[PDB]
Amino acid sequence: LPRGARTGAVKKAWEAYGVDAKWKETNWAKKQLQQERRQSLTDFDRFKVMRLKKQRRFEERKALAKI
Amino acid sequence: QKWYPAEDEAQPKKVRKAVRPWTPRKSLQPGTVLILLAGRFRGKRVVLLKCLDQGVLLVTGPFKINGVPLRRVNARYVIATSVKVDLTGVDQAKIDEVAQPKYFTAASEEAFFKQGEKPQKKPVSSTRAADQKAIDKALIANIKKVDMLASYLASSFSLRKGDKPHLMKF
Amino acid sequence: MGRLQEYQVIGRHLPTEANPNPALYRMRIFAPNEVVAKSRFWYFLRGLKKVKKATGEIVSVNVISEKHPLKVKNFGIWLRYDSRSGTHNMYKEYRETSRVAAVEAMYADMAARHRARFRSIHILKVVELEKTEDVKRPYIKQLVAKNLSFPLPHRVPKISTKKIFSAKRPSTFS
Amino acid sequence: PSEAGHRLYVKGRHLSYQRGRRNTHPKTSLIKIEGVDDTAAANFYLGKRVAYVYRAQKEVRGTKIRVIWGKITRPHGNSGVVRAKFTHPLPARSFGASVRIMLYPSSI
Amino acid sequence: MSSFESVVVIDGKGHLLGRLASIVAKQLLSGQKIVVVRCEALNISGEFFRAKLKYHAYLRKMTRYNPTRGGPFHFRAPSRIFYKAVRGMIPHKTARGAAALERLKVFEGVPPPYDKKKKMVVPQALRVLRLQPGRKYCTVGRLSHEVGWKYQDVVARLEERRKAKGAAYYERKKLAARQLSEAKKAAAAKVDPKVSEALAAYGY
RNA sequence: AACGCGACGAUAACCCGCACGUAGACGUAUAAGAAUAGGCUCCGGCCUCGUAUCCUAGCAGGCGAUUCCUCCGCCGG
Numbered sequence: 001l002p003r004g005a006r007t008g009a010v011k012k013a014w015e016a017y018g019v020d021a022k023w024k025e026t027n028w029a030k031k032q033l034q035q036e037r038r039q040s041l042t043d044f045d046r047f048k049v050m051r052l053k054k055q056r057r058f059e060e061r062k063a064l065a066k067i
Numbered sequence: 068q069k070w071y072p073a074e075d076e077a078q079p080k081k082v083r084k085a086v087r088p089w090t091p092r093k094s095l096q097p098g099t100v101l102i103l104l105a106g107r108f109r110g111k112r113v114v115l116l117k118c119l120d121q122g123v124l125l126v127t128g129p130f131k132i133n134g135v136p137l138r139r140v141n142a143r144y145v146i147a148t149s150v151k152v153d154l155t156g157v158d159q160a161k162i163d164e165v166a167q168p169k170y171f172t173a174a175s176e177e178a179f180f181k182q183g184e185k186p187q188k189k190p191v192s193s194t195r196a197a198d199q200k201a202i203d204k205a206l207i208a209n210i211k212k213v214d215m216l217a218s219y220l221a222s223s224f225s226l227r228k229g230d231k232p233h234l235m236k237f
Numbered sequence: 238m239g240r241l242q243e244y245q246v247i248g249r250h251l252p253t254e255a256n257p258n259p260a261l262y263r264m265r266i267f268a269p270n271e272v273v274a275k276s277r278f279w280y281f282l283r284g285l286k287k288v289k290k291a292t293g294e295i296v297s298v299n300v301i302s303e304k305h306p307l308k309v310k311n312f313g314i315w316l317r318y319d320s321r322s323g324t325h326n327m328y329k330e331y332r333e334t335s336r337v338a339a340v341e342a343m344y345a346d347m348a349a350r351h352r353a354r355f356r357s358i359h360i361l362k363v364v365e366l367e368k369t370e371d372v373k374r375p376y377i378k379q380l381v382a383k384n385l386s387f388p389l390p391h392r393v394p395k396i397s398t399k400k401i402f403s404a405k406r407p408s409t410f411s
Numbered sequence: 412p413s414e415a416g417h418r419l420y421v422k423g424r425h426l427s428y429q430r431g432r433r434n435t436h437p438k439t440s441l442i443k444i445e446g447v448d449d450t451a452a453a454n455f456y457l458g459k460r461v462a463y464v465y466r467a468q469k470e471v472r473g474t475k476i477r478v479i480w481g482k483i484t485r486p487h488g489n490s491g492v493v494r495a496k497f498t499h500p501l502p503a504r505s506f507g508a509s510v511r512i513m514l515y516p517s518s519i
Numbered sequence: 520m521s522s523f524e525s526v527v528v529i530d531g532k533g534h535l536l537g538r539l540a541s542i543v544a545k546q547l548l549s550g551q552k553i554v555v556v557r558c559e560a561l562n563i564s565g566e567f568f569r570a571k572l573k574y575h576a577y578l579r580k581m582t583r584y585n586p587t588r589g590g591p592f593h594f595r596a597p598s599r600i601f602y603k604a605v606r607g608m609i610p611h612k613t614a615r616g617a618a619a620l621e622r623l624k625v626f627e628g629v630p631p632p633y634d635k636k637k638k639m640v641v642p643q644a645l646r647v648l649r650l651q652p653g654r655k656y657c658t659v660g661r662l663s664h665e666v667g668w669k670y671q672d673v674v675a676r677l678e679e680r681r682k683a684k685g686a687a688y689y690e691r692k693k694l695a696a697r698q699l700s701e702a703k704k705a706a707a708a709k710v711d712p713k714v715s716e717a718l719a720a721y722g723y
Numbered sequence: 724a725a726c727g728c729g730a731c732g733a734u735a736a737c738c739c740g741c742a743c744g745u746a747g748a749c750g751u752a753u754a755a756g757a758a759u760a761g762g763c764u765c766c767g768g769c770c771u772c773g774u775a776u777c778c779u780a781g782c783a784g785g786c787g788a789u790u791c792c793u794c795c796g797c798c799g800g
Binding site (some may be wrong): 391393394396397398399400401402403404405406407409 | 520521522524527529542546637639640641642643645647648652
């Protein structure tokens, strides 16, 4: 990136390097995506979360007793 | 009337306050799952059948899922949720019949001798029991179609650690 | 002072039958709003010339905006400030994107470093160093230098002031 | 067994009355709701029913629990404290006591 | 974020004396139970001789007739130095103030019922988040030892034994995290992937 | 310390009559240490962030199944 590059040069560098793609792969955006899915959970959706975590942990408890 | 007015009790001024209908909130659509906040059915997850006049809502459980019968509740005493169960197949004519306000509103030896005694709890009417069954039979069939909706309506809402209602969405 | 603006104030003496069509003076004034820009115009003008508010009128007031408030310019401000001894000249330099940001940083600098108030500072000339190698202060030349790149050691996290207690100890590496 | 709670209220504490330095007005009471930090979060709790439950050492209605009911009227400060009005002003000894904020009346 | 807890225990290590005291005193008057742990590891800003000057000026103030009654009782322990700072921020002459001081508990070191609990920290009084890097600071434990505290070696020996028990606990905690990750990967093969697809979308 | 604390020795089980059942619980769940011009770790990697992690469905939580070896509690050793 040159110093003092205007909006045209920075836009062409963003598209060439594809920094929208590598931002999505960053651990910070995965954290930001997960926490956005927190707040979108409705009351019914939070109940299915409780039910499926119960179903998931039944296997994880079983495997831990095996280990 | 019959009596000439015996005292200086004056008739009131003509009051210009006209009764205009109550517009409910946009969330209060028929089929919306509600959360009861007060009463003996506090914390129960019910469904809304029809929005009635002056801020009250007609509500059923259904009775075979959680245990709340055909009841009226106040709109302000209810949290409305985003989940809506299909009303297809539910008799609208029976809903209009139970929406009538009289459906829920309504000296001797025996009179003296039950004084001070707790009156026995009245067993349920056969008309109300049959009216419940004619409504919930299509509701429950629609409820069974969507996964985990029946267990969701059987369960009770509760607040846990860190649950902030000013950010939670229903 | 706050969101300062820069105003062009045109004023003149009131016209007279003996002296029609007067001299029509002009000054550039850094003021928060219009009513102090007019007040600071008549303050300076009565200091230089005989013309005063009762015998004069304001011809025009127009705000002036930056040509390019999105480019970074090095600014040199010559100022004259009054202390308990007398009047002294300074040439200070600051790095901003606008002329009102130049004098905003000037008043904060002179107040912090020399305890100077607004009524003691006289903004003599504000110039934009159009070409580099005319920067003559060591702190600004330090920022102008080639392929400049610095880290940010000991960045304190922004923890909310109403979160009184926290479980994990904070880190200062971000 | 359910092994669940029955909490349909939001916890809060009774901080003090409304006051300057040397002038206190007990008709209005300052409440710190658990979780609210701003005026924007406090705005959700305006016009909500507020209860202060306590004990008696004498059964009056078959129970030893007496309740004073009120409502949250307006926010207070920048830190999320609300100020509430009760039918009878809260004692003074309850500075720091638990206060229940109900979720009704509701506009959700 | 404005949480309400039964008893909150604060690790005093790396904490400024007065800035922790003003937070604790505001919490105590709000109705929160406070337990302060490792008061000898608290920090005071400035240099050490300034703190040594200030306590010797405090040690200069005594009542004439008899120091048993009415005299300023000079406490040489780190916990009571912190207790003096909190008490000055409390209207202790009133009944509300004394009830708030009853909600406070201060200890030198980490006693056995409180080394099993989770010690929280106050970011508004931490030295590394508040003090400028070049500036000097002192420790209350070395202030108290050079003014009359006689239990510094006792506390240091008791803290050494707590680290050894803590180090063995962390190895077991490390092993339990091993077995949980091994079980989670193994149970994921038989975990009905319609469930895991829905949980991933929901955030979990 | 006469309104600070500890160890120890010996005590008060009967029978007759009668007076009453929270300076603030509501999931009152969560132990590394240490550094903060560094640290943690499956040795792959990870760290602004507790916006986390466990628990949370059932007449204030019934009865009987289908079905499951998971979690909780009491006694011992």
